[PDB]
Design a binder for this molecule. Structure first.
Ligand SMILES: Cc1cc2nc3c(=O)[nH]c(=O)nc-3n(C[C@H](O)[C@H](O)[C@H](O)COP(=O)(O)OP(=O)(O)OC[C@H]3O[C@@H](n4cnc5c(N)ncnc54)[C@H](O)[C@@H]3O)c2cc1C
Ligand SMILES: NC(=O)c1cccnc1
Ligand SMILES: [Mg+2]
Length: 309
């Protein structure tokens, strides 16, 4: 059944924490673990990082932590590096169910010369490689938390939540779904529908697949899960199978859920959105609806939640 989590006083706050720690005086947290989430055929490396904040940097699901990687700011001699934000992939109780850790889902940003494929360490992403290279006991300069766009609307515990992720965009949804299904949170008993769509490059690039598949078996009447593997699947038109093509497969169900008040969430890199918008426009047109008008209504009704970069 549901996992006991502590301390329940984390449910008492009525507002999310924001900017508890700031860049000039970050919280020095400690790495608990770092593990690759992906198999050898994955085009890139994505890691799961567990960080001990000791209960000093609590957060709500959907927020981000800032990390200040070591070194001097290249564009600002004598200054610390700029904060990089990472979507927290854990619930407020964390992966140890104790309110002392938070987790990140971090894609290594690696540079390859577009012609030769060669590498250059001065051009890899600083913070993503810093994090995925970390080992237990390493210290991390933590700031935040920050962000409110992806806070989970809990007013209606029987709401519908349609979660659209590419790659590390799955992070907030791992936290949402643990809160909805895994953890014993007496003041939030989810009885709605949560529907996760995840687009990645191939099967080896899947993130947390075992956890999500387990929810299908534990909460079959409350959870749905669809995956789009761009390099291993092709869409109805011959294009690579992107998450928007999976959305299109369920277009009638999704549009009806939206009309009924479902929340819809988009998270990941911003390049995911143009194809999604194109598909939604096409779906709307086939149904005889204006996607522009529908989207305006979804935004007005606070059903549309996008955090991409
Ligand atoms: C709200 C928010 C949440 C986020 N959540 C996540 C998350 O959960 N997971 C995640 O992985 N990311 C997330 N990101 C992105 C993350 O913040 C970083 O931007 C990302 O990790 C890259 O940072 P970095 O320090 O590794 O790369 P940087 O050092 O900032 O470099 C940026 C890019 O420039 C490239 N580059 C550097 N020098 C050169 C050069 N000379 N020529 C060509 N290219 C170069 C790097 O390879 C890299 O791709 C989020 C962003 C935001 C705004
Ligand atoms: N988790 C992510 O990949 C993410 C979230 C928000 C902005 N950019 C990237
Ligand atoms: Mg795998």
């Amino acid at each position: 059944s549901k996992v006991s989590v502590a301390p329940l006083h984390l449910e008492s706050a009525k507002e999310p924490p924001l900017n508890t720690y700031k860049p000039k005086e970050p919280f020095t947290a400690t790495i608990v673990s770092v593990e690759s989430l992906v198999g050898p055929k994955a085009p890139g490396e994505t890691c799961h990082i567990v960080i001990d904040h000791g209960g000093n940097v609590p957060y709500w699901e959907g927020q981000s932590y800032g990390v200040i990687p070591p070194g001097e700011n290249p564009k600002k001699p004598g200054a610390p590096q700029n904060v990089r934000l990472y979507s927290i992939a854990s619930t407020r109780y964390g992966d140890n169910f104790d309110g002392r850790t938070g987790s990140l889902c971090v894609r290594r940003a690696v540079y390859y010369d577009p012609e030769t494929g060669k590498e250059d360490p001065s051009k890899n992403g600083v913070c993503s490689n810093f994090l995925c290279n970390s080992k237990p006991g390493d210290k991390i300069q933590l700031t935040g938390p920050s962000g409110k766009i992806m806070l989970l609307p809990e007013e209606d515990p029987n709401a519908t939540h349609i979660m659209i992720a590419t790659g590390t965009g799955v992070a907030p949804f791992r936290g949402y779904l643990r809160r909805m299904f895994m953890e014993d949170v007496p003041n939030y008993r989810f009885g709605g529908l949560a529907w996760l769509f995840l687009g990645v490059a191939n099967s080896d690039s899947l993130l947390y697949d075992e956890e999500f598949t387990s929810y299908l078996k534990q909460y079959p009447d409350n959870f749905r899960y669809d995956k789009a593997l761009s390099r291993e699947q092709k869409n109805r038109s011959g294009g690579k199978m992107y998450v928007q093509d999976k959305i299109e497969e369920y277009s009638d169900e999704i549009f009806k859920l939206l009309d009924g008040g479902a929340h819809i969430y988009f998270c990941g890199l911003k390049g995911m959105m143009p194809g999604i918008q194109d598909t939604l426009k096409k779906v709307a047109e086939r149904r005889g609806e204006s996607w522009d008008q529908k989207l305006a209504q979804l935004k007005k009704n606070k059903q549309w939640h996008v955090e991409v970069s």
